[PDB]
Amino acid sequence: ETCSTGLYTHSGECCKACNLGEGVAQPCGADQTVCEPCLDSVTFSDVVSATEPCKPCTECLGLQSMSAPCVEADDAVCRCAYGYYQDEETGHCEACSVCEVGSGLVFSCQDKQNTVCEECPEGTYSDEANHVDPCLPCTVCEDTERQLRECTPWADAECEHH
């Protein structure tokens, strides 16, 4: 009858752990442990202990936007707001740097990863500067259609015909 918990009732017996979604209500002193299911969106036992009760659901604030909601089984997880990423050297939510004109998107701005841009290579261009558009391919007119603006690392080409 190995006790998993490590706590024993006074009577000598092994103490009943409180599983996930169950936190400690009254410890196994005189009697056994009394477990009660957690409140949703409010508390949670994300562990199996005869000691630990229903902890309070992590709240999200400011740049803490929610990624996973809080349930009895598991706590809620917050992450950086739409615009930003978690800074490994600031522990704070800094905002995604944009891919300026003449430059495009390569990998987007994830939770821990800042925007990764790229200098628009031969034959591409960037209309604007944001962390959404990548480099687009340049129009090519036609050996017929007259060519007005040629294509630059920062603006598409322009044309017209008869």
């Binding site: 949703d40 969106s41 936007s65 990624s67 909601p69 739409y82 990998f107 959404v132 687009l136």
Partner: protein, 110 residues
Amino acid sequence: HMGEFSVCDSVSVWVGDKTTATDIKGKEVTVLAEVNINNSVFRQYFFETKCRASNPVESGCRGIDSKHWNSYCTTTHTFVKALTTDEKQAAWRFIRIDTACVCVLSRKAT
């Protein structure tokens, strides 16, 4: 090199503060929020997704063949069982929550 790019940019978010929705049947209806019944807060969360915009480019969706097709990104619904309230009575119903953003073609005549 993902390095891969959507054709309709989209923004998803967790929606705890939801107070209105539309019956699957099509019937406008309301949701619950604070619901401080029992000193608690309860709450119903949903995962909504919608479009950065209709035309992420002047041509429409990102990277269609703008030469033969017109395009425009729209929002796609899906249904969830959640707790609603139609007037006095309040029961469980299925609500049409946004869930993704996808581009829609149409050809050009000539």
